[PDB]
């Protein structure tokens, strides 16, 4: 997994690769790692995948109820505080590592959260096994006052460093752009540079190839 | 890791006569190779003509004696000032110890008094409540040095009438209090010569129908 976040002058962008693994095996060649906490607060996770998922949904749920109760747009610092308090309570056993990013009525926000419940704020961040390959690109290219286009390019390049150079990462690049102006735009499979090449042969079997012992029709209804 | 137990040495001895009992102990209290005190008593009058010692881990010993003294006090309250008989005390001490079967008092406990018939009585308990009435008993660091002497000199074991060839055991007799004190003082001078945790002083408590009398003797301070 490679996840990055990059703040630009009018907002924040998050990107992630689309490979999920089970030890050395690739389970899903195009999973979605970018989660929604609320319409304009988005999340990217690494570590235990069920943990990042569940924790994202629990806090997304509570954030919605909070939003309705207060008649206000949800704030990123609220997702942050709720996430870190939950994670801390569990002393690291919920192995969720997240880059949380969003826009709210106070502006644009970028944080990271570790499984034990510690948070950090930054202009650019990365997590997951591709973390170091991505950081190397970010430390080489990040500058202050990036435009929207530049931030997407930078975030996408950093995910690429992960795809190519980290074995835990591969396939495609998902992006989400959150600007202070409009709606959050989710660019699923923003890049697809890893298309499986055409197979050398079809492995379609002639019918009757498999031997059958018995056969019956199965009933659904009642 | 915290070890809740310690070992403060010491050595206790109980002998029962026809119409008296003695419970003796040394006054030395130790930790590893240090002397904490040369005079810290560990044989106590508990009221109702019962003396008690709980040798081993002194913290546990003190808690137990405290609890038994209290048990005697409430016996008086709950049961119209009735005298607590030695067998009844013994059974009560079993329950005190067994209440801590899964976090025991590390003590060898001995009690002495007179039974309902006015006979000398000695009972002894293992760390978890197992008990038995006996004629005599040594406890603590040097019990293994002393018990065999008492078997020999108090119960006349392995002794035979000269000239019977080994066919007729020396008959078992009751000892006088003078005779018993001679044995106690000798047991303790022996134990002091050979066990590093025994020394400094010997405090003997004697129980008769006239109450509880106390004697003290200097022991070797090395």
């Amino acid at each position: 997994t490679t996840i990055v976040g990059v703040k630009f002058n009018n907002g924040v962008v998050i990107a992630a690769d689309t490979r999920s693994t089970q030890g050395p095996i690739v389970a899903d060649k195009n999973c979605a790692k970018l989660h929604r906490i609320s319409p304009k607060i988005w999340c990217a996770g690494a570590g235990t995948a069920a943990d990042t998922e569940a924790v994202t949904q629990l806090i997304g749920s509570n954030i919605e109820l909070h939003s309705l109760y207060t008649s206000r747009e949800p704030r990123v610092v609220s997702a942050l505080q709720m996430l870190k308090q939950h994670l801390f309570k569990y002393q690291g056993h919920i192995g969720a590592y997240l880059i949380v990013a969003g826009v709210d009525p106070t502006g644009s926000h970028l944080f990271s959260i570790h499984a034990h419940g510690s948070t950090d704020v930054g202009y650019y961040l990365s997590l997951g096994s591709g973390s170091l390959a991505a950081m190397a690109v970010l430390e080489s290219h990040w500058k202050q006052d990036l435009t929207k286009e530049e931030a997407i390019k930078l975030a996408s390049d950093a995910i690429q460093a992960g795809i190519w150079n980290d074995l835990g990462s591969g396939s495609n690049v998902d992006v989400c752009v959150m600007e202070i102006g409009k709606d959050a735009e989710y660019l699923r499979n923003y890049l697809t540079p890893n298309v499986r090449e055409e197979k050398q042969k079809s492995y379609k079997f002639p019918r009757g190839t498999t031997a059958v012992l018995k056969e019956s029709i199965v009933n659904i209804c009642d | 890791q915290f070890n809740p137990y310690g070992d403060n040495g010491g050595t206790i001895l109980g002998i029962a006569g026809e119409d008296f009992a003695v419970l003796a102990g040394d006054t030395r209290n130790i930790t590893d190779y240090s002397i904490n005190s040369r005079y810290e008593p560990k044989v106590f009058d508990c009221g109702d003509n019962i003396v008690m010692s709980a040798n081993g881990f002194a913290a546990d010993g003190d808690a137990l004696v405290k609890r038994f003294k209290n048990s005697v006090k409430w016996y008086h309250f709950d049961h119209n000032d009735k005298k607590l008989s030695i067998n009844s005390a013994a059974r009560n001490i079993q329950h005190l110890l067994y209440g801590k079967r899964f976090f025991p008092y590390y003590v060898h406990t001995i009690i002495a008094g007179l039974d309902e018939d006015g006979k000398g009585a000695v009972y002894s308990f293992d760390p978890v409540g197992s008990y038995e009435r006996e004629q005599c008993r040594a406890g603590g660091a040097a019990a293994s040095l002393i018990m065999p002497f008492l078997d020999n000199q108090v119960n006349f074991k392995n002794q035979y009438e000269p000239g019977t060839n080994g066919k007729v055991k020396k008959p078992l007799k009751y000892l006088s209090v003078e005779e018993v004190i001679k044995l106690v003082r000798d047991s303790f001078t022996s134990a002091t010569e050979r066990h590093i945790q025994v020394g400094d002083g010997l405090e003997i408590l004697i129980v008769t129908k006239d109450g509880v009398r106390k004697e003290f003797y200097e022991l070797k301070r090395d």
Binding site: - | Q1, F2, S34, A59, A63
Partner: protein
């Protein structure tokens, strides 16, 4: 179940004809780092009791709080709080002993060794020890830590048994204690030059001395010592 972190070293004490002396250095070690140098480990309770404490300093500070409000509590609805119903050394000790033993029995010790030094209102000297296991004992002299191994032998040369106590004057006893504190500074790697000493006298009451120093030290012989065996220069 825990481990001491910031620590204090030995506390030493003995009783003389009219009272009791207790002393402890002003250091709080952090393993081998001699970290904090302004630490009072003698705690006066009223003016007839000093509680000397070694071991974990966080736990020492908790015991302080416990003693202070033990004095508060004793004053509640107590018109004789500064007279016949004043706190006694024996009361203060029995309270601490109880706490210590309950804490070890819950497998959560106060990581300390404590000496309670004072004078009872009937005039009797009080000197008693309790520690993290709830083990208690009394003796004409008492000392914790390295004090147990080095100070006790020195102080017992002044008071060997009970009968030596009427023969021992405050001057003699304060001398023995101040000397043992020098020895402890010579051989205890966790000791400090600065210490505090308190006397509880049945006539004079509580004298509390701060900022004492180990003085008159022998080091001059050092210069002649070279090498570790064969070396001559």
């Amino acid at each position: 179940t825990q481990q001491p972190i910031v620590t204090g070293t030995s506390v030493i004490s003995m009783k003389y004809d009219n009272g009791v002396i207790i002393a402890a250095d002003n250091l709080g070690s952090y393993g081998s780092l001699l970290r904090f140098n302004g630490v009072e480990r003698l705690i006066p309770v009223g003016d007839n009791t000093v509680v000397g404490i070694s071991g974990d300093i966080s736990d020492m500070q908790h015991i302080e709080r416990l003693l202070k409000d033990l004095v508060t509590e004793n004053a509640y609805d107590n018109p004789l709080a500064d007279a016949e119903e004043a706190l006694e050394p024996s009361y203060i000790f029995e309270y601490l002993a109880t706490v210590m033993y309950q804490r070890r029995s819950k497998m959560n010790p106060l990581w300390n060794a404590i000496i309670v030094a004072g004078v009872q209102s009937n005039g009797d000297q009080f000197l008693r020890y309790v520690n993290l296991l709830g083990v208690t004992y009394s003796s004409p002299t008492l000392a914790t830590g390295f004090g147990a191994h080095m100070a006790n032998p020195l102080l017992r040369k002044v008071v060997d048994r009970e009968s030596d106590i009427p023969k021992t004057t405050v001057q003699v006893a304060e001398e023995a204690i101040v000397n043992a504190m020098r020895v402890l500074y010579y051989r205890d790697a966790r000791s400090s030059r600065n210490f505090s000493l308190a006397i509880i006298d049945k006539n004079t009451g509580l004298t509390f001395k701060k900022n004492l120093q180990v003085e008159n030290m022998k080091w001059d012989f050092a210069k002649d010592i070279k090498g570790y065996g064969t070396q001559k220069i």
